[PDB]
Design an enzyme around this catalytic site. Sequence first.
Site, mmCIF file in Angstrom:
data_model
loop_
_atom_site.group_PDB
_atom_site.id
_atom_site.type_symbol
_atom_site.label_atom_id
_atom_site.label_comp_id
_atom_site.label_asym_id
_atom_site.label_seq_id
_atom_site.Cartn_x
_atom_site.Cartn_y
_atom_site.Cartn_z
ATOM 1 N N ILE A 7 0.864 -1.174 0.000
ATOM 2 C CA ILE A 7 0.000 0.000 0.000
ATOM 3 C C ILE A 7 0.903 1.227 0.000
ATOM 4 O O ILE A 7 2.065 1.164 0.412
ATOM 5 C CB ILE A 7 -0.965 0.007 1.214
ATOM 6 N N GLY A 8 0.377 2.344 -0.493
ATOM 7 C CA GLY A 8 1.088 3.613 -0.469
ATOM 8 C C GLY A 8 0.518 4.535 0.596
ATOM 9 O O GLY A 8 -0.697 4.692 0.710
ATOM 10 N N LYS A 9 1.414 5.142 1.374
ATOM 11 C CA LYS A 9 1.010 6.040 2.450
ATOM 12 C C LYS A 9 2.012 7.177 2.563
ATOM 13 O O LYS A 9 3.223 6.943 2.536
ATOM 14 C CB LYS A 9 0.911 5.297 3.787
ATOM 15 N N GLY A 10 1.502 8.401 2.692
ATOM 16 C CA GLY A 10 2.329 9.570 2.911
ATOM 17 C C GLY A 10 3.218 9.976 1.759
ATOM 18 O O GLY A 10 3.865 11.028 1.847
ATOM 19 N N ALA A 13 7.030 6.603 1.999
ATOM 20 C CA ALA A 13 7.378 5.323 2.601
ATOM 21 C C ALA A 13 6.416 4.261 2.092
ATOM 22 O O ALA A 13 5.304 4.564 1.652
ATOM 23 C CB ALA A 13 7.337 5.388 4.131
ATOM 24 N N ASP A 167 -32.185 57.457 23.151
ATOM 25 C CA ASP A 167 -31.912 57.111 24.542
ATOM 26 C C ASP A 167 -30.404 57.089 24.758
ATOM 27 O O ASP A 167 -29.717 56.164 24.311
ATOM 28 C CB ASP A 167 -32.541 55.767 24.892
#
Lengths: 343, 635, 635
Positions: A7-10, A13, A167
Site C-alpha cells: 500500500i502507499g502512504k504519505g 514510505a 436614549d
Amino acid sequence: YLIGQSIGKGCSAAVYEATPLAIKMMWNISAGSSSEAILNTMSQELVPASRVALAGEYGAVTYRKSKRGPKQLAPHPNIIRVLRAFTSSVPLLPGALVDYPDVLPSRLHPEGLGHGRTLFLVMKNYPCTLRQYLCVNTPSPRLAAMMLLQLLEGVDHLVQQGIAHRDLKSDNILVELDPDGCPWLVIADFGCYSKADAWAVGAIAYEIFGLVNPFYGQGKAHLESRSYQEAQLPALPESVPPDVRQLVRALLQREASKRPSARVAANVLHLSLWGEHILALKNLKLDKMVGWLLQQSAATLLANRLTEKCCVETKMKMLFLANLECETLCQAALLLCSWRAAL
Amino acid sequence: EEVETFAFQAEIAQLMSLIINTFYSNKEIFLRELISNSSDALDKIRYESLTDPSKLDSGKELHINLIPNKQDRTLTIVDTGIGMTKADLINNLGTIAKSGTKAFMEALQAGADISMIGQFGVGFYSAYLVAEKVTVITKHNDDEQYAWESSAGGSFTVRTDTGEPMGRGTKVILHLKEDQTEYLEERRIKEIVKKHSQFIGYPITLFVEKERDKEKIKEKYIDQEELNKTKPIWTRNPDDITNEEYGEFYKSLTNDWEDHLAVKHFSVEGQLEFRALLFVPRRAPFDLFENRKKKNNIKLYVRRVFIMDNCEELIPEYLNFIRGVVDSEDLPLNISREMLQQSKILKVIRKNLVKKCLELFTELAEDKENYKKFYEQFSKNIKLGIHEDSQNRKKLSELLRYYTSASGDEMVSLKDYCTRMKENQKHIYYITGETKDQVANSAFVERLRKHGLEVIYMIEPIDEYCVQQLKEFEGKTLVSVTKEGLELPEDEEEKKKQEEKKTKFENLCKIMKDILEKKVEKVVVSNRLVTSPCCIVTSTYGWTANMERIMKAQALRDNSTMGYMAAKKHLEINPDHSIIETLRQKAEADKNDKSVKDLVILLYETALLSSGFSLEDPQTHANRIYRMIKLGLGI
Amino acid sequence: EEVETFAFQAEIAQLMSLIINTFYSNKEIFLRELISNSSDALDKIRYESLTDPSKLDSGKELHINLIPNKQDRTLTIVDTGIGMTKADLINNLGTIAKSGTKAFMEALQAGADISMIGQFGVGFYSAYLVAEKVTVITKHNDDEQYAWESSAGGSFTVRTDTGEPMGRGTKVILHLKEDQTEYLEERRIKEIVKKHSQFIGYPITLFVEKERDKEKIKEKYIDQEELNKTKPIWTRNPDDITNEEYGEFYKSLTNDWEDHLAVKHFSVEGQLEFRALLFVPRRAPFDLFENRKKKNNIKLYVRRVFIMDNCEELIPEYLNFIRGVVDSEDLPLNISREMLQQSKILKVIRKNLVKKCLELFTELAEDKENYKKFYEQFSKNIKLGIHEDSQNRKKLSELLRYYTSASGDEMVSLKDYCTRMKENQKHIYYITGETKDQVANSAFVERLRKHGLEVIYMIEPIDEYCVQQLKEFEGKTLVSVTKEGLELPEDEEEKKKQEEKKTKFENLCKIMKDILEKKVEKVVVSNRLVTSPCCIVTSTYGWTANMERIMKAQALRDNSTMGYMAAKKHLEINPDHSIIETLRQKAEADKNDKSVKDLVILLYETALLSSGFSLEDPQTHANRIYRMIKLGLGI
Ligand SMILES: Nc1ncnc2c1ncn2[C@@H]1O[C@H](COP(=O)(O)OP(=O)(O)O)[C@@H](O)[C@H]1O
Ligand SMILES: Nc1ncnc2c1ncn2[C@@H]1O[C@H](COP(=O)(O)OP(=O)(O)O)[C@@H](O)[C@H]1O
C-alpha cells in the site's frame, strides 16, 4: 524476511506487514532535491534504534550517511510509525549517488527549532460604566472636556449613519478604564430625532464635571420634547472654562434651530483644546481656509507638549484631527467668540 | 490547397457590454478616467503652445472644473484642453480601442517631455458605468462647437452645437442614474479626487452651489475651491528641495501635527525606472503592530495617478512604519489599471527599497539624539527584521543598542562592547530577563562583574526571538550567562581550587541529588556564584528560563510544543557560602537528617524563584514560610 | 440641427493586443480557458444526444486528451465534443467577443439542464499568451474536417484539412515559444489541471510518452492516466450521500490519512444561489494560527471551476480551520475570471456560512464524546471568536466548556453551572490562573469552597481576552474571585462578627499601612480568607494579576500602555489566623518594633508571591530567607 501487502502512504514510505510486525519500508531517491527531506525522514525515523543494530556493510552502505543514524534521543512528534534498524544499498551504489556532503556530522537538529511569532492581539478592558467611574472619581476639566469631545464625535458618527440614538444616558455609555492609563470612552446601549441626542450628551456633560444634572434628577431625561419648566440653565461651577460652559449652554438650549449640531460642537472643542489660545481663534479673526486648517493642525501638537501623559489625547489627535471640514470649522471659529465677545 | 484568408472583425454590442460591465471593479473609477483624459488634453495643448503661443489666445489658463448639478442629475467636467475636431471626435470616441493620445505621442519627436496617462483606447466608455446618456460638447481651434451624444446603444449623434461659445475647451455632461445619484454631493467627490488623481499638474476646482439665502447674511453664493493643492515634489530634482518642503508634503500626504523625522529621496534609472520618496514618522503609530489590514503605507503611483495600496510584497512587513510614495513612469498594467501583470517587478522594487532604507537608517545613526528617538520608538521593528530576514541581518545588527553593566544609563551598540572587550575575552556575555533592575542584581552576573567583564541587559520579550537567531557578531559569539556550560578565562590555581572544591563537595551534591528527586537533572559545584548560596541554570540545549516563561504566557500557543520544549534545570551551589559549608557538615555528620532535607528543599525553592523560573505550586512554599514564621514567633 | 448618427466600430489590432496582454494576470490561465470551452462543447453534444442518439454514432465516449509533444513544442488538446462547421468556425473564432455557447443556450428552451462555462466571447484568444501560431482542426457532423490557423496577425486561414479522419471532435494545436516551453512537461500540467478545472464532468487524460526502451524491461510505453478522478459530490443532493463518500472526498480534496470529523452540506435558493460543503478536520493543523498567508481554506467555485482562494472576507478569521468549498451557479465576474465585481455579495455569503457552521457546532455538541475531541483541539478558535465578533457571542458562549471545583476531572458547560447554582447565589465565580492545580489550592477560593459554592478554573492565557468581554451569561453576571469588592450571601451575625473584627483590627491595618508605604494602596480585613494569614487583591477597576502578567510577557507590546495599565493592589488579612492575632499583640504593645516591620514586610512578600504576582527584585526576598536560615542554624 517475509512481509505483507503493498500500500502507499504519505508518499514517502512503503507499508508491508512482516512475520506480526509492520515493516514501514523507506524508499529514498537521491536524484531530486526532495531527497534531502527524505534523508531527514531517514534520520527522524528509527528514534529508538540501537546504536550497533545496523546490518549494512560499509562496502555497500556509506558509513558517512549512517554514522549518526542511530539516534541517542529525539522527540519525533509528527510521524508515529517506525521500522527496524538496517539499511540496504547496492554495492556499486544506485544512480545519482549521494553527494556525501559530509555536512555537520556531530550536529543535532534541535527538536522544536521551528518556532513562530504568533498573531498579536489587543486587549480592551471594560470594567465599569460611566456612572460608576464618575461616582468613584471625578477628573480635572481638561480630560473631562476630552471625554465630552469623544462623546460628541461618537454621536455625530452615529446619526450620520441614519439611526437616531435617542436614549443616551449615564448608564448606556461604557468606559474602557485603563488602570492608570487615561480612560477611553465608548458608546453603547447595553441598557435598553436630530440634536436630541446632542441634548442628552449635553446633560451628561454637565454630569461629568461632578454636578448632578437637573434634567436627570427631577425628570425630562428621555427627551427635551417634554420641555422642562425651569426655562433657565443650571450654573456649572466657575472652575470650568467659560468656553465649554457656553457650549453646554447653547447645546441644550430651548430653541431647536439655534442648537449647534454635533460636528460644529466637536470641532469647536477641537479648536479650544488643541489649537492654542490665539487672537485668531477669538474675535472671529481667523479667515477660514484649508491652509488655516493645516495651520491649526500645526497648532495642535502644542497640546501634546504639555498634555502627553494622556494616551487618550494622542489617540484622539490621531483619530479626529484628520476628519474635520472647512465649513463647520468656520462656523465653530465664528460662534466661539461671537458668544465670547458678546458685542 | 485553396486558402481563404480573412481579417478579424468584432461584434460591437457585446464588446461594449463587456467594456462597461466586466472591466472595472468599483464604479467610482470613472472619475479618474475622465480626469486623466482631460489632463492629457491639457498637456497636449500645453506642448503646442511652446512653438507658437498664438494657439493659446483662445484660453490662457489651464484648469479642470467639476459642476455637479442636483436639479438635473448632471455631473459636468469642463476643462480648457486642446479639444477635438469633428473627424477627430468620430475617430476617437466612436472607434473602440483607439486612443488619439498615443497617436499624437508617437507622431511627436523622439526627445520630447510629455508624459500622457493612457494609450489603451477604452477608458472613456467607463463613464457609462454610472450614466445612461453621455453628452460631450467641445470646441477646438480649426473647428466649431460640436455636440456628441450617446446612450451606449451602438449609436451616437454628432450635431453642430449652437450653445454659448466655450472657446478652446471640452466639457463632458453625464446623466447619472438614480442608483448612482450619490456621486452628486461633494463629500464622495472630494474623497475620490483625493484618493485617485490627487497629484495632477492642473488645478481641479469644485463648483458646489451651497448658497444659503437666509436673508447680507447669505453665505457661500458660489464655492470655487481647489483640491489638488499640493504639488508632487518627488518629480522635482533633489539637492534643491530644502528640508522644509518635505515637511509640508508630509503633513498634507498624511494628516499630522508634527514634522517627519528623516527623508530619503532617490531614483533608479535602469530598464526598470522609478523614483521614490520615503518618510520615517516622528511618532510611532499606536495601532501599528495591531493588524489594521493595512500592511504597507507605501503608495504606488504610475505617471502621477494612484494604482494600488497595501500590497504586502512591495515592502517587508517589519518595515511598515515607513510612509511614502513610489512613482514609476511605465509598467505593465492590467486593463483595469489596478494591478500589475507580472508581480516579479515588485520583488526588484522591494530589494531596492529595503537597501535604500537600510542606508537611510545607517546615515541616521550618525546622529545620537535623533537616533535615540528613532530607536526608542521603533526598536521593535528592527528586532523583528533581525528575526525574519536572513540577508540584511548582518547589516541590521549594528543598528541595535543595549544597556550594559558598564554602560551606565544610556544605551550602547555592540561595536562599543567589542571595542571595550578585553584581550583574553572571546565572547559577548548577555543576560535576558524582564527588567533592568532585577537583572543587574541577579546571581549569575556576580562573578563576571567582579572580574571586570561587561554584560548585556536584554529586558524585553521581543529580545529572545532576535538573539536566538543572532548567534554571532563580528567574529565574536554571543553566550548567555544563564546557560549550563559557562566558562571564564582564569588562571591555573583557580582550576586547582575548583577541582579541590569538587573533591570536597562531591558527596554533598549526590546527597542533595537523591533529595529533590526528578525536580532537577543535576547538581554541581558552581564557578559563577559569589555572595549567593545556590542558583539554578538550564541545560546548554533547550529553552532558557525567560524564553520558556515568555512562550508559556504567549497567547495562541500550541500546548503540545509547550510540553515538548521544556527546559532541563541544573542546580549549582557556591562552595564559599557559609550556608553551604554548614550544610555539608550536617550532611557528612548525619546521612539522613530531616532538617537537612527540608532545608535543601527550601533552598531549592528560593533558588528557583530568584533564577527567574515561576514556581509550580506557590502554596506549598508559602506554607513552609508560614511554618517557619510560626516557629520563630513561638506558636 | 443636422444630426449625423453613426455606430461604433473597433480597431482590431490594438483590441487583440489588449485581449492578449492586458487581461489575465498569470499565463497559466490559458489551459483553464481551453479546457472549459472543450467541456462546453462536450455538454453541447451531450444535450442533443438525448433527443436523437444517432448523432452520437460518430463517437461514443466523451473525454478530453492532452498530448504534449516536446519534439515539436506542440501541446495538443483533443476532445470528442460537438465541433464546428466552416461558417460556425468563421463566426465564432473570427468575430471577437462573440460566443456560440451563449447563442446556443439562449436559443435553447427555458427549462433546460445545461450549465455552460463561458458566455463573454474572448476566452479562446488567451491561448496566445503562450503560443505564436495556433492551429484548430475540427470535424463536426454536417461538415468535413476543416483547419484554422492564425498567428494573431489580424488574419486567419481556413482550409479543408486532408489529414486523418477525426470523427466528431475538435483538437487544438499550440506552437509554444521557447520562453514558455516549461508547460510541455507533465508536472506543471498536473498542477494546473488540479488547481483549476479539477472538477470537470468529463475525464481528462494525459498522454506522456515516457517509454524507457532500456531493453522486456521497457516500461511506460504510453501513459494514459486520469486527473479529474473525484467527482464533485456537492452537486449531488444530500440525504443520499452516506457519511462515507464525504470521507474519500475529504481525503482527495486535502491530502490526509484520516477521515473528517463532521460535515455540513446545505444550499441557498434565493436570488443569490449557491451550494456549500463544509468540513471540520479531525486534527488541528500545527501551523494553523501561525500566519501562513493562508487566511481561509474555503475555495470558491463558479460552475465547477476555481475562482479565488484566501480572500479573507469570505469567512471570519477565527473560523480558518474550516476546510471546504462553496459553489455558485452565477455571479458577477471580472473579465479575467479571478475576482468578483461587487464584494458586497461576499458579505451575505459570510453571514450564511457563519450561521450554518454555528448550527453545525451546536448539533455537534449533542454528542459528548465527539465534542470533547473537537473542543479539546479547537477551543482556542471559539474563544477567539467570542473575543472578536459581537453578534454570535451569545450563541458562541454555550459552546464553551470549563473545569470547576465540583466538576471533578471532566469539563462542563456554563448551563450546568447555572443549573447547579444555589437559590441565593446570583453570580458566577471564576478564577483565572496559569494551571489547574495551583488555582485549585489558591487562597481566594478557600471561603467559597467551604461555603459550598462552585468556581470556574480558567487556566490558559487566551481566557482573559474572552472573559473580559464575556461579562454576562443568561441573566447571571461573571465575577472574578480575585477582585477587591467580593461579597457572598451570609447571615447577619456574620456581619456583626465582621464589623467587630474591623473595630478590633482597625489600628493594625493602619500600622501595616504606614509600613509597606507606596507598595500597596490599602490594607483591610478580609472576608474570603480561611487557613491563610494574608492575601493581596487588585482593585475593582483595572487589570488583574494574571492579566497584567500575561500582557507584560506578551511580545510586540507597547511599553507606554504597560506603564499606563498597572494594577492597584489591596492587601487583605485573615483576622482568625494565629499569626495575625500575635502580630496585633506585638503591634498594640510596641507601636514601632522592628521585629514587626521585617515580619510584615516578609508576610507581604510571601502574599505577593502566592497571589500570582511576580516579585520585583527576588534577590531581596532571597536574602531575607537566607538571613532567616542562617539565624535558625546559628550562624
Ligand atoms: N477632454 C478631452 N479633450 C480632448 N480629447 C479627449 C478628452 N477626453 C478624451 N479625449 C480623447 O478621446 C480618446 C479616447 O479616450 P480613451 O482612450 O478612453 O482615454 P485614453 O486615451 O486616456 O486611454 C483619447 O484618445 C483622447 O484623445
Ligand atoms: N473545443 C471546441 N469545440 C467546439 N467549439 C468550441 C471549442 N472551443 C471553443 N469553441 C467555440 O469558440 C467560441 C469562442 O470561444 P470563447 O468565447 O473564447 O470561449 P467561451 O465561449 O467559453 O467564452 C465559443 O462560442 C465556442 O462555441
